[PDB]
Design a binder for this molecule. Structure first.
Ligand SMILES: O=C(O)c1cnc2ccccc2c1O
Length: 438
């Protein structure tokens, strides 16, 4: 496959559903390269667990943890890492309230080159155990010979765009990694980088991040087809922010408008949102504790009951993962019969203004609170007009894209409710025999 899109291993499915999945131990294995140094961008860390995932012979190589924690949380993280002399930390600045550092990325510097991994999992045991998570693996990028002058750039501008993303941190430990990236040839990259960084962007910077970045890429590198208004938009996520009192405030005005862009020319497009129901969580491999990682609060939800009429159940028979709750986030544009897609995005970004940005100042400024990162698969980047949807995720056709959940998505039933993490569920017990009492 050209796509290099993987799911994480799930404990408890049959081996045919883990063949071609990756555990973190597989990613860090010496088979992938001889590690010299690594950077782990993430949100939540279990440092003891993390060091155990590196091969024994690599466990004292330098590791940089890039995080967003402040005050006592920051103290706790430093305390976790102090036993390990080879671990340094970088606190990403979060100068806008209610922002977080959500980006999940590994930079892996080898003897043989450089690899970039953009994924959706926290660096804790439970995120790699029984959840549906996504991984994009870069090629092995070779070093550019000392004295050679070449750009090392791809047709998707990935090298410049990744450096731009790192420059936004304004951090000395990441200037070191920027210089590493400058020294390597990333020209084989066939995905586009879509990042969010905190700030207020106007003018020439408006298109750099968030949903305006997506819109710009779709305008420039995708084509509109006849009956484009019939091609749905699908969003699939593990948390929802406060989106406003009705759909016109943000979801179906600026967000959907960005996601329905195709081509350069100037809505009733169906919008499917996939988010686990209470019954999805109850009957999951983890049971109700899976809801610990689906943090939709009742305070937020009761302000926007209009939203839930868009919600569809989690179902993933195609990858044997209907009972492995999603922490992956994906967005895509299928054809009306769900047999093709015009593009696919895997990202850390949930369905929130904090992650995707919200227009301010009379439409002239895009304000983003958080760090997020994902990669966009466009048919043009692969010499194609569209992607065929792979019928079984782990089956085997070569330019068919592996969509990890079932299509068409299934609407909530009248008795279903969206998983809301801070109210009790005591009517029916979960797969481990327990109720949920927050
Ligand atoms: O990975 C993330 O982006 C993230 C961020 N905040 C979270 C808050 C509660 C539970 C899970 C969370 C999570 O999984």
């Amino acid at each position: 496959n050209p796509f290099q899109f993987y799911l994480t291993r799930v404990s408890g499915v049959k081996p045919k559903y883990n063949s071609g999945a990756l555990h973190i131990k597989d990613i860090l294995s010496p088979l992938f390269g001889t590690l010299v140094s690594s950077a782990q961008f993430n949100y939540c860390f279990d440092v003891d667990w993390l060091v155990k995932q590196y091969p024994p012979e690599f466990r004292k190589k330098p590791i940089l943890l890039v995080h967003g924690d402040k005050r006592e949380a920051k103290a706790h993280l430093h305390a976790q890492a102090k036993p390990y002399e080879n671990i340094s930390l970088c606190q990403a600045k979060l100068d806008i309230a209610f922002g977080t550092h959500h980006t999940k990325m590994m930079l892996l510097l080898y003897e043989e080159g450089l690899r970039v991994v953009i994924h959706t999992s926290n660096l804790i045991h439970a995120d790699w155990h029984q959840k549906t998570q996504g991984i994009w693996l870069s090629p092995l990028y070779p070093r550019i010979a000392d004295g050679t002058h070449k750009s090392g750039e791809s047709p998707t501008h990935f090298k410049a765009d990744l450096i731009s993303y790192l420059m936004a941190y304004n951090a000395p430990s990441l200037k070191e990694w920027i210089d590493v990236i400058h020294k390597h040839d990333l020209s084989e990259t066939n995905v586009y980088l879509i990042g969010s960084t905190p700030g207020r962007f106007q003018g020439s910077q408006k298109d750099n991040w968030g949903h305006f970045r997506l819109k710009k890429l779709l305008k420039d590198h995708a084509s509109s087809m006849p009956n484009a208004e019939s091609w749905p938009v699908v969003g699939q996520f593990s948390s929802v922010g406060s989106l406003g009192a009705d759909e016109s405030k943000w979801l179906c005005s600026e967000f959907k408008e960005s996601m329905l862009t195709l081509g350069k020319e100037s809505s009733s497009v169906p919008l499917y949102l996939i988010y686990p129901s209470v019954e999805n969580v109850r009957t999951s491999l983890e049971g109700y504790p899976a809801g610990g990682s689906l943090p939709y609060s009742i305070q937020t939800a009761e302000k926007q009951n209009w939203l839930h009429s868009y919600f569809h159940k989690w179902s993933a028979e195609t990858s044997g993962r209907s009972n492995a709750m999603p922490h992956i986030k994906t967005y895509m544009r299928p054809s009306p019969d769900f047999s093709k897609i015009a593009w696919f995005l895997v990202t850390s970004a949930n369905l929130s203004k904090a992650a995707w940005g919200a227009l301010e100042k009379n439409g002239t400024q895009l304000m983003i609170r958080s760090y997020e990162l994902g990669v966009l698969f466009l048919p043009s980047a692969f010499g194609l007009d569209s992607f065929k949807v792979k019928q079984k995720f782990f089956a085997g056709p070569m330019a068919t894209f592996p969509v990890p959940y079932d299509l068409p998505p299934e609407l909530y039933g009248s008795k279903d409710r969206p998983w809301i993490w801070n109210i009790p569920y005591v009517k029916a017990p979960d797969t481990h025999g327990n109720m949920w009492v927050p």
